[PDB]
Amino acid sequence: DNREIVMKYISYKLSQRGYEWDAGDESEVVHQTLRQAGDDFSLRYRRDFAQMSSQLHLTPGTAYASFATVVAELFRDGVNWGRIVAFFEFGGVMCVESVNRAMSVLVDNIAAWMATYLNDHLHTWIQDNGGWDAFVELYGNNAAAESR
């Protein structure tokens, strides 16, 4: 389910910062692989997230517009797994930031916007491209390459 993968992902990100989410908490290997891929994405692009956040100026009034803007740029050159990982980690980072700015009402909204975008705009692609199992396979190949 699209709701479930978003929910597990967001739950994990918030739990990483000690935040337990009222509405929170696909194979287990899929969730685990997406968790690691997102964590590596954040490690590499930490500085970029910090700069982008500053540009977006998160508020309840502008959160949806910022979410839509980011996602439109992310997928401007089409969908691939790497960009889907970016998507998840962007939604995660935005949920952590919401909580940090005493805007925790946004977490539920961001999770809904993520699940909707998955449903309306990534679902076809995912299925055409072998589903979440293909993501796991890709991750494996890349891990073996990065090892050697």
Residues that bind ligand J1Q (CB under 6 A): 45, 48-49, 52, 69-70, 73-74, 82-83, 86, 90
Q: Name the residue among 118, 139, 111 with its Cα closest to residue 75.
A: 118
Angle at 27 between CA 146 and CA 8, to 5 degrees: 90
Q: What's the rounded Cα separation, in Å, for the pair 130 and 105?
A: 35
What does the block give as tokens for 50?
């910090």
Q: What's the rounded Cα separation, in Å, for the pair 125 and 118?
A: 10
- Which residue, 27 or 64, is less far from ligand J1Q as judged by CB? 64
Report the nearest approach of ligand J1Q to the CB of residue 22 (Å). Answer: 26
- Which residue, 30 or 52, is less far from ligand J1Q as judged by CB? 52
Report the nearest approach of ligand J1Q to the CB of residue 93 (Å). Answer: 8
- Which residue, 27 or 59, is less far from ligand J1Q as judged by CB? 59
- Which residue, 74 or 138, is less far from ligand J1Q as judged by CB? 74
